[PDB]
Design an enzyme around this catalytic site. Structure first.
Site, mmCIF file in Angstrom:
data_model
loop_
_atom_site.group_PDB
_atom_site.id
_atom_site.type_symbol
_atom_site.label_atom_id
_atom_site.label_comp_id
_atom_site.label_asym_id
_atom_site.label_seq_id
_atom_site.Cartn_x
_atom_site.Cartn_y
_atom_site.Cartn_z
ATOM 1 N N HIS A 165 39.846 46.708 32.463
ATOM 2 C CA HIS A 165 39.679 45.283 32.642
ATOM 3 C C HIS A 165 40.382 44.501 31.519
ATOM 4 C CE1 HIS A 165 36.832 45.522 35.907
ATOM 5 N NE2 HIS A 165 36.178 46.505 35.280
ATOM 6 N N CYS A 176 43.963 42.867 34.314
ATOM 7 C CA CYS A 176 44.138 41.515 34.845
ATOM 8 C C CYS A 176 44.911 40.676 33.825
ATOM 9 C CB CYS A 176 42.769 40.779 34.878
ATOM 10 S SG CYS A 176 41.653 41.719 35.943
#
Ligand SMILES: *[C@@H]1O[C@H](CO)[C@@H](O)[C@H](O)[C@H]1NC(C)=O
Ligand SMILES: *[C@@H]1O[C@H](CO)[C@@H](O)[C@H](O)[C@H]1NC(C)=O
Lengths: 413, 412
Positions: free
Chosen positions: B121, B163
Site C-alpha cells: 500500500h 498507489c
C-alpha cells in the site's frame, strides 16, 4: 371572483434571512396588485426583523436596492405555529383544524383563484418547515386533491423555491386539478442563492447574510417590471426559467420545471397576482449572477462572521456543523454498505429514477425509513433532507423495515 | 559482478495476502535465474503461510495456476523487523545498523547490480510498512544517494507496486545515480489487484483473498515466460505498461511510469534478474483482467466473509467504515478551518503538474502528519490517501502553529 394567496418561508435563523425576505417581498407585491390582506396568509418564523444580527432593526430587504418589505406584513402563522399541519389546514380553508396563529385560512369559493409561493430548504420529495420539520410531497398533493374535491377554487398557481423541488411533483402531480406548478429546480439539482456578501451588484456592505433566492427574486422582479394585465403565466415561466438557468450554466444555475395543468399558462398573471398601476411595462427585447447553492450558504455565513471577528467560538461552531454533516453523510453511506455491500451501496442510494417517475412508490415506507434512521442516528435536520433519495431508494429496492432497523442499529448504536 | 536483490512486502493481514505472495513469487523467480540466496534479502511480515484462514496451510500462491511460492523463502526480516529503518540499513549494506532479523544486508561491490521490488500500500509521496508505519519518498531517495556515494554498485533497477507510486520519484529522483525505476501508477492514480474471488480466469474457489497485484504479476509473468538473456529492461517495461493499462481502460488500469537513468533500459534483463536455463528457446518477446482497486480490497474481503457466514463481521465492517469517515472528515474539516469552506477542498485536493515534487519541504510534510496524528489519531494504512492534503498545506505556506490550532479544533 376573489384572489387568495399563501406565502410560506420554511426555515428560520439569521443565516436563512433570504427565505423570509422572499416571502415579505411577495406579500408587498400582491398588496400593490390589489389583493386584500384578509385573503393572503403568511407563514414566517418571524425571527429576522428584530434579530440581534440584523444591521437594520425592524427592516427586511430582498435585493441590493434596499427597500424595506417587512412593514405591514401580517403575523398569521409565526414561530412554532409554522407547521405542515397548519399549512394544510390553511389551504383546505378549515379554521377548526388550525392550531394557534391568527385563524386566517383560504375559505375560498368556486370562482376564486389561489397563488401559493414557498421558499426554503428541501430535498428529494420533501420541503422543510422550521425546527427540523419535514413536509412530504404526497401529503401536499393529497391536500390539493382534497381542496379540488370540495370545489374550493377555479384555478391555482404554485411557485416552489427549494432544492430538488421538481421531485415534489414529478410522477405524482395530476393534471386534472386546475393547478399549475413551477419549481426552481429539477428533481436532482440544487436551488441557488443570490445577493450574497461580496457579490455584484453589491448588496449593502453591512449585510453578512444573503438577501434572496434566485428563482424567487426572478419571478418577483419580473412581475414588478411588467403590466400584469398583459403578461401571461407562460411569459413569466419563460423569463424565470431563462434567469434561473444563469446563461445556461448549470454549474451555477438550475432548470425551472412545470407540472400540472399547462392550459393555465395562457392566463394573464393579474388573475393570480393582481395589477400594480404604477408599473411601466418593460418590453421583452441583464447580467450573469454570482450565486451559491442553498446548502453552501450556512458555512459561508459562519466563515464571513469568523473573518469579520469570540473568533475561536465561531471556529468551534463551524467544526460542530461540519462534524454533524459528516455524521449524517457517513451514516447514510454506511447503511448502504450494510444493506447492499461495498461498491453496490452508493449506486443504489444515489441512483436517480428515469424522468417522469415518482421518487418513491410507497410514501408511508419513505416516512418509516426516516423514522427508523432518526431513532438510531439522530435528527436529519434541514441538511439531512439531502439524503431523502437514499431513503426512497431503500424503499424501492424491496429492503424491509426490519433490515433497515438492523443496519441503522449497527451503523449508529 | 554479483547480482543482489531486496524484496519487500509493506503490509500484513490475511486481506493483504497478495503483497507477500508477490514477493515470494519474485524470490522464486530470482533463484531460478541463478541469483544466490545470500544475495537476496526478503522483508515479509510472514503472517500468511500459516494463517488460520489460509486454505492451504504452509503454502502461498500468486496466480490461479496454484504453484506454491513459499517453500524455501528466507526469513530475513519478518514480523516487527519489517521496518523502514531495517530496509535502509539493508540497502546501505551496514550490518551494524540493522535491528533484529537475520543480519543479511546488501554489502555489494562497485561491479555489482541490484534489483529492488516493493509491493504494498501507499499514498502520495509515501509507502506503507506493517503496523501503521509510513516510509517517506525523500528518505528513500537519500538512501540511494548515500549508497551511490559509497560506490556500492554499478547499476540498479527498482520496481514499485503501490498507489500513486509515481509520486515517490516525480521531481525528486536524480538521473545521475545509475538507478532506473518503474512504478505501477502515476502520481495521482491507484494501483490494481488481480486474481480476486469471483473473477475469471478463476482462482481456486477456496480462496477468499486476492492472490496478486496487477503490475507485480505483469512483470513476474513476463520474466518467467521469456529468455532474459535476450529480453531487455525496456522490453519488460513496455510489456508491463501495456498489461497494467488493461486495454487502455484507465477506469480499471494504471499508467506505468519510468524515472531515473533510462540508459539502463538498453540492458539485458538477466543482468538484474538472472537467466532461467529452461527458457533458452522460448519464442522471442492476452485477455482483459477483472481488477479491483487496492483501497477497495479490504471491504470486499470483509463482505465476502459476511456472505460466506454473522453480526460480528458486520460490526467489523462498520468500525472500518467509521474509521475511514473519521479520517476523511477530519482532513476535510482542517481544510475548511485553514482556507475557508469554498476553498479547502480545491487546496487539499489539487494535484501539481507532472514532473514537480509532491512537496517542497519534506520535513514540513512529516511535521504536518505528526501534528495531525497527535490530535486526530494514527493515519493507519488507509490514511496514506491524505498525504497530498498534508503536502498541499505545507506548499500553501500555512504555518505549523496554524496547523496545530486547526487540528485542535477539528479533533480535540
Ligand atoms: C387543456 O386544453 C385542451 C384544449 O382545450 C384540452 O383538450 C385539455 O383536456 C385541457 N387540459 C386538461 C387538463 O384537460
Ligand atoms: C545516457 O546516455 C547518453 C548517450 O546516449 C548520455 O548523453 C547521457 O548523459 C547518459 N545519461 C546519464 C544520466 O549519464
Amino acid at each position: 371572483g376573489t384572489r387568495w394567496a399563501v406565502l410560506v418561508a420554511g426555515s428560520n435563523g439569521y443565516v436563512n434571512y433570504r427565505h423570509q425576505a422572499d416571502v415579505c417581498h411577495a406579500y408587498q407585491l400582491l398588496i400593490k396588485g390589489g389583493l386584500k390582506e384578509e385573503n393572503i396568509v403568511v407563514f414566517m418564523y418571524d425571527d429576522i426583523a428584530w434579530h440581534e444580527l440584523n444591521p437594520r432593526p425592524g427592516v427586511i430587504i430582498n435585493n441590493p436596492r434596499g427597500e424595506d418589505v417587512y412593514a405591514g406584513v401580517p403575523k398569521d402563522y409565526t414561530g412554532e405555529d409554522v407547521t405542515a399541519e397548519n399549512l394544510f389546514a390553511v389551504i383546505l380553508g378549515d379554521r377548526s383544524k388550525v392550531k394557534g396563529g391568527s385563524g386566517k385560512v383560504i375559505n375560498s369559493k368556486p370562482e376564486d383563484r389561489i397563488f401559493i409561493f414557498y421558499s426554503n430548504h428541501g430535498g428529494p420529495g420533501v420541503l422543510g418547515m422550521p425546527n427540523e420539520q419535514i413536509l412530504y410531497a404526497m401529503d401536499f398533493i393529497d391536500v390539493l386533491k382534497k381542496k379540488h374535491a370540495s370545489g374550493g377554487y377555479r384555478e391555482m398557481v404554485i411557485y416552489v423555491e427549494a432544492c430538488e423541488s421538481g421531485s415534489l411533483f414529478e410522477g405524482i402531480m395530476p393534471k386534472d386539478l386546475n393547478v399549475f406548478v413551477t419549481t426552481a429546480s429539477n428533481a436532482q439539482e440544487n436551488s441557488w442563492v443570490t445577493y450574497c456578501p461580496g457579490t455584484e451588484p453589491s448588496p449593502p456592505p453591512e449585510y453578512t447574510t444573503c438577501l434572496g433566492d434566485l428563482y424567487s427574486v426572478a419571478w418577483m422582479e419580473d412581475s414588478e417590471s411588467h403590466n400584469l394585465r398583459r403578461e401571461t403565466v407562460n411569459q413569466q415561466y419563460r423569463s424565470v426559467k431563462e434567469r434561473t438557468s444563469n446563461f445556461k450554466d448549470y454549474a451555477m444555475g438550475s432548470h425551472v420545471m412545470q407540472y400540472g395543468d399547462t392550459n393555465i399558462t395562457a392566463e394573464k398573471l393579474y388573475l393570480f397576482q393582481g395589477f400594480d398601476p404604477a408599473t411601466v411595462n418593460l418590453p421583452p427585447h441583464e447580467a450573469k449572477m454570482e450565486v451559491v447553492h442553498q446548502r453552501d450558504a450556512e458555512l459561508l455565513f459562519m466563515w464571513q462572521m469568523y473573518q469579520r471577528s469570540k473568533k475561536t467560538h465561531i471556529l468551534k461552531q463551524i467544526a460542530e456543523t461540519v462534524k454533524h454533516r459528516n455524521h449524517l453523510d457517513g451514516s447514510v453511506e454506511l447503511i448502504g454498505v450494510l444493506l447492499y455491500g461495498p461498491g453496490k451501496g452508493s449506486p443504489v442510494l444515489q441512483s436517480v429514477r428515469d424522468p417522469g417517475l415518482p421518487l418513491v412508490d410507497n410514501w408511508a415506507c419513505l416516512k418509516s425509513m426516516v423514522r427508523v434512521f432518526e431513532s438510531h442516528c439522530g435528527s436529519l435536520t434541514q441538511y439531512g433532507m439531502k439524503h431523502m433519495r437514499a431513503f426512497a431508494n431503500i424503499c424501492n429496492s424491496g429492503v424491509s423495515e426490519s433490515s433497515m432497523e438492523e443496519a441503522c442499529m449497527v451503523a449508529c448504536g
